[PDB]
Coordinates of N, CA and C in Angstrom, one line a residue:
Chain A
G1 N 0.7 -1.2 0.0 CA 0.0 0.0 0.2 C 0.8 1.3 -0.1
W2 N 0.5 2.1 1.1 CA 1.6 3.2 1.2 C 2.3 3.2 2.5
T3 N 2.3 2.0 3.2 CA 3.0 2.0 4.4 C 4.4 1.8 4.3
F4 N 4.9 1.4 3.2 CA 6.4 1.0 3.0 C 7.3 2.3 2.9
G5 N 6.6 3.5 2.7 CA 7.4 4.7 2.6 C 7.4 5.5 3.9
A6 N 6.8 5.0 4.9 CA 6.7 5.7 6.2 C 7.0 4.9 7.4
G7 N 7.9 3.8 7.3 CA 8.0 2.9 8.4 C 8.5 1.5 7.8
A8 N 7.8 0.7 8.3 CA 8.1 -0.8 7.9 C 6.9 -1.3 7.1
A9 N 7.2 -2.2 6.2 CA 6.2 -2.7 5.0 C 5.2 -3.5 6.0
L10 N 3.9 -3.4 5.7 CA 2.9 -4.2 6.3 C 2.0 -4.6 5.2
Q11 N 1.7 -6.0 5.1 CA 0.9 -6.7 4.0 C -0.5 -6.4 4.3
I12 N -1.2 -6.5 3.0 CA -2.7 -6.3 3.1 C -3.1 -7.0 1.7
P13 N -4.3 -7.5 1.6 CA -4.9 -7.9 0.2 C -5.4 -6.8 -0.7
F14 N -5.2 -7.1 -1.9 CA -5.4 -6.0 -2.9 C -6.8 -5.5 -2.9
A15 N -7.7 -6.3 -2.8 CA -9.3 -5.8 -2.9 C -9.7 -5.0 -1.7
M16 N -9.0 -5.0 -0.7 CA -9.3 -4.1 0.4 C -8.5 -2.9 0.5
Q17 N -7.2 -3.0 -0.2 CA -6.5 -1.6 -0.4 C -7.3 -0.8 -1.5
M18 N -7.9 -1.4 -2.5 CA -8.5 -0.5 -3.5 C -9.8 0.1 -2.8
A19 N -10.4 -0.5 -1.8 CA -11.5 0.2 -1.2 C -10.9 1.3 -0.3
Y20 N -9.7 1.0 0.4 CA -9.3 2.1 1.1 C -8.9 3.3 0.3
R21 N -8.4 3.2 -0.9 CA -8.2 4.2 -1.8 C -9.5 4.8 -2.3
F22 N -10.4 4.1 -2.5 CA -11.8 4.4 -3.1 C -12.6 5.3 -2.2
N23 N -12.4 5.0 -0.9 CA -13.0 5.8 0.0 C -12.5 7.2 0.2
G24 N -11.3 7.5 -0.4 CA -10.8 9.0 -0.3 C -11.2 9.9 -1.2
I25 N -12.1 9.6 -2.3 CA -12.7 10.6 -3.2 C -14.1 10.7 -3.0
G26 N -14.8 10.1 -2.0 CA -16.2 10.3 -1.9 C -17.1 9.1 -1.8
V27 N -17.0 8.2 -2.8 CA -17.7 7.0 -3.0 C -17.4 6.0 -1.8
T28 N -18.4 5.3 -1.3 CA -18.4 4.4 -0.4 C -17.7 3.0 -0.7
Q29 N -17.8 2.0 0.0 CA -17.1 0.8 -0.3 C -17.9 -0.3 -1.0
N30 N -19.2 -0.3 -0.6 CA -20.1 -1.4 -1.3 C -20.2 -1.1 -2.9
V31 N -20.0 0.0 -3.3 CA -19.9 0.3 -4.6 C -18.8 -0.3 -5.3
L32 N -17.6 -0.5 -4.7 CA -16.6 -1.3 -5.2 C -16.8 -2.8 -5.1
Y33 N -17.2 -3.3 -3.7 CA -17.5 -4.6 -3.5 C -18.6 -5.3 -4.3
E34 N -19.4 -4.5 -5.0 CA -20.5 -5.0 -5.9 C -20.1 -5.1 -7.3
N35 N -19.0 -4.4 -7.6 CA -18.6 -4.3 -9.1 C -17.1 -4.5 -9.3
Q36 N -16.8 -5.6 -8.6 CA -15.3 -6.2 -8.7 C -15.0 -6.4 -10.2
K37 N -15.7 -7.3 -10.7 CA -15.4 -7.9 -12.0 C -15.5 -6.8 -13.2
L38 N -16.4 -5.9 -13.1 CA -16.5 -4.9 -14.1 C -15.2 -4.0 -14.2
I39 N -14.9 -3.6 -12.8 CA -13.7 -2.7 -12.7 C -12.3 -3.4 -13.1
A40 N -12.3 -4.6 -12.9 CA -11.2 -5.5 -13.3 C -11.0 -5.6 -14.9
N41 N -12.2 -5.8 -15.4 CA -12.2 -5.7 -16.9 C -12.0 -4.5 -17.6
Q42 N -12.5 -3.4 -17.0 CA -12.1 -2.1 -17.5 C -10.6 -1.6 -17.3
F43 N -10.0 -2.1 -16.2 CA -8.5 -1.8 -16.1 C -7.7 -2.5 -17.1
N44 N -8.2 -3.8 -17.1 CA -7.3 -4.8 -18.0 C -7.3 -4.2 -19.6
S45 N -8.6 -3.8 -19.9 CA -8.7 -3.4 -21.3 C -8.0 -2.0 -21.4
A46 N -8.0 -1.2 -20.3 CA -7.4 0.0 -20.5 C -6.0 0.0 -20.7
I47 N -5.3 -0.8 -19.8 CA -3.8 -0.9 -20.1 C -3.7 -2.1 -21.2
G48 N -3.3 -1.6 -22.3 CA -3.2 -2.5 -23.5 C -3.4 -1.8 -24.7
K49 N -4.0 -0.5 -24.7 CA -4.0 0.3 -25.7 C -2.8 1.3 -25.8
Chain B
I1 N -19.3 -9.3 7.1 CA -19.8 -10.6 7.7 C -21.4 -10.6 7.5
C2 N -22.0 -11.7 7.6 CA -23.3 -12.1 7.3 C -24.3 -12.4 8.4
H3 N -25.1 -11.9 8.8 CA -26.1 -12.0 9.9 C -27.5 -11.8 9.6
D4 N -28.3 -12.9 9.8 CA -29.8 -12.7 9.6 C -30.1 -12.5 8.0
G5 N -29.2 -13.1 7.2 CA -29.5 -12.9 5.9 C -29.2 -11.6 5.2
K6 N -28.2 -10.8 5.7 CA -27.9 -9.5 5.3 C -26.4 -9.3 5.3
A7 N -26.0 -8.3 4.7 CA -24.5 -7.9 4.6 C -24.2 -6.6 5.4
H8 N -23.3 -6.9 6.3 CA -22.9 -5.6 7.1 C -21.5 -5.2 6.9
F9 N -21.3 -3.9 6.6 CA -19.9 -3.3 6.1 C -19.6 -2.5 7.5
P10 N -18.3 -2.4 7.7 CA -17.9 -1.5 8.8 C -18.0 -0.1 8.5
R11 N -18.0 0.8 9.6 CA -18.2 2.2 9.3 C -16.8 2.8 9.3
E12 N -15.9 2.7 10.4 CA -14.5 3.0 10.2 C -13.6 2.0 11.0
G13 N -12.9 1.3 10.3 CA -12.0 0.3 10.8 C -12.1 -1.0 9.8
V14 N -11.6 -2.2 10.4 CA -11.3 -3.4 9.8 C -11.9 -4.5 10.6
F15 N -12.1 -5.6 10.1 CA -12.5 -6.9 10.8 C -11.4 -7.7 11.0
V16 N -11.1 -8.0 12.3 CA -9.9 -8.9 12.6 C -10.4 -10.1 13.5
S17 N -9.6 -11.1 13.6 CA -9.8 -12.2 14.4 C -8.6 -12.8 15.0
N18 N -8.5 -13.3 16.3 CA -7.5 -13.9 17.0 C -7.4 -15.4 16.8
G19 N -8.5 -16.0 16.1 CA -8.5 -17.5 15.9 C -9.8 -18.0 16.2
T20 N -10.6 -17.5 17.2 CA -12.0 -18.0 17.5 C -12.9 -16.9 17.7
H21 N -12.6 -15.6 17.6 CA -13.4 -14.6 17.9 C -13.3 -13.5 16.9
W22 N -14.3 -12.7 16.6 CA -14.1 -11.5 15.8 C -14.4 -10.2 16.5
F23 N -13.7 -9.2 15.9 CA -13.8 -7.8 16.6 C -13.7 -6.8 15.5
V24 N -13.5 -5.5 16.1 CA -13.5 -4.3 15.1 C -12.4 -3.3 15.6
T25 N -11.5 -2.8 15.0 CA -10.4 -1.9 15.4 C -10.1 -1.0 14.4
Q26 N -9.5 0.1 14.9 CA -9.0 1.3 14.0 C -7.9 0.7 13.2
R27 N -7.5 1.3 12.0 CA -6.6 0.9 11.2 C -5.1 1.1 11.5
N28 N -4.8 2.1 12.5 CA -3.5 2.5 12.9 C -3.1 2.3 14.4
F29 N -3.9 1.5 15.1 CA -3.6 1.1 16.4 C -4.5 -0.1 16.9
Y30 N -3.9 -0.8 17.6 CA -4.6 -2.1 18.1 C -5.4 -1.9 19.2
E31 N -6.7 -1.9 19.1 CA -7.7 -1.6 20.2 C -9.0 -2.3 19.8
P32 N -9.1 -3.7 20.3 CA -10.1 -4.5 19.9 C -11.5 -4.0 20.6
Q33 N -12.6 -4.2 20.0 CA -14.0 -3.9 20.5 C -14.9 -5.0 20.0
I34 N -16.0 -5.0 20.6 CA -17.0 -6.1 20.3 C -18.0 -5.4 19.3
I35 N -18.6 -6.2 18.4 CA -19.5 -5.8 17.2 C -20.8 -5.7 17.6
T36 N -21.3 -4.4 17.4 CA -22.7 -4.2 17.7 C -23.3 -3.5 16.4
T37 N -24.6 -3.0 16.5 CA -25.0 -2.4 15.4 C -25.0 -0.8 15.3
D38 N -24.1 -0.3 16.3 CA -23.9 1.1 16.4 C -22.6 1.5 15.6
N39 N -21.9 0.6 15.0 CA -20.8 0.8 14.1 C -20.6 0.1 12.9
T40 N -21.8 -0.3 12.3 CA -21.9 -1.1 11.0 C -23.2 -0.6 10.3
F41 N -23.2 -0.5 9.2 CA -24.5 -0.3 8.1 C -24.6 -1.6 7.2
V42 N -25.9 -1.7 6.9 CA -26.3 -2.8 6.1 C -26.7 -2.3 4.9
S43 N -26.3 -3.1 3.8 CA -26.7 -2.8 2.3 C -26.7 -4.0 1.4
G44 N -27.9 -4.5 1.1 CA -28.0 -5.5 0.2 C -28.4 -7.0 0.8
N45 N -27.9 -8.1 0.0 CA -28.0 -9.4 0.6 C -26.6 -10.1 0.7
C46 N -26.8 -11.5 0.9 CA -25.5 -12.3 1.2 C -25.1 -13.0 0.0
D47 N -25.2 -12.5 -1.2 CA -24.7 -13.2 -2.3 C -23.9 -12.5 -3.5
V48 N -23.4 -11.3 -3.1 CA -22.8 -10.4 -4.0 C -21.3 -10.3 -3.7
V49 N -21.0 -10.2 -2.4 CA -19.7 -10.0 -1.9 C -18.9 -11.4 -2.0
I50 N -17.5 -11.3 -2.2 CA -16.6 -12.4 -2.3 C -15.8 -12.5 -0.9
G51 N -15.9 -13.6 -0.2 CA -15.3 -13.8 1.1 C -16.1 -13.4 2.4
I52 N -17.5 -13.6 2.3 CA -18.4 -13.3 3.3 C -18.1 -14.4 4.3
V53 N -18.1 -14.1 5.6 CA -18.1 -15.0 6.8 C -19.4 -14.9 7.6
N54 N -19.5 -15.7 8.6 CA -20.7 -15.8 9.5 C -20.4 -15.5 10.9
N55 N -21.3 -14.8 11.5 CA -21.1 -14.4 12.9 C -22.4 -13.9 13.3
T56 N -22.5 -13.4 14.5 CA -23.6 -12.7 15.2 C -23.4 -11.2 15.5
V57 N -24.3 -10.5 15.3 CA -24.2 -9.0 15.6 C -25.2 -8.6 16.7
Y58 N -24.4 -8.0 17.7 CA -25.2 -7.9 19.0 C -26.0 -6.6 18.7
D59 N -27.3 -6.8 19.3 CA -28.2 -5.6 19.2 C -28.2 -4.9 20.7
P60 N -27.9 -3.7 20.9 CA -27.5 -3.1 22.2 C -28.6 -2.8 23.1
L61 N -29.8 -2.5 22.4 CA -31.0 -1.9 23.3 C -32.2 -2.9 23.4
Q62 N -32.8 -3.3 22.2 CA -34.1 -3.9 22.3 C -34.1 -5.3 23.0
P63 N -32.9 -6.1 22.9 CA -33.0 -7.4 23.7 C -32.3 -7.1 25.0
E64 N -32.6 -6.1 25.6 CA -32.0 -5.7 27.0 C -32.7 -4.6 27.6

């Protein structure tokens, strides 16, 4: 995540780190937790153009 | 977590367990607490999230 630049590295799964970041712009967490597949597909298609 | 056929998400913090019990704590310090309905909100049903577990959610007032 972002804890390796301010101390010691601490592990965390990816799908929860994305919710952590997603909470910082206004939208809540269930929006991400209910649309994981669509977001993964969009990201995968975006990187490749 | 999933209780009574519903999905409960945390308000501020994470879900942690010591092996046989579940708690709620802040993300930057270790201070365990018991799960009630005053620090979670419910949205949807129990078939959309991946990794849902089972437990019981304490109701603080009505059954007391």
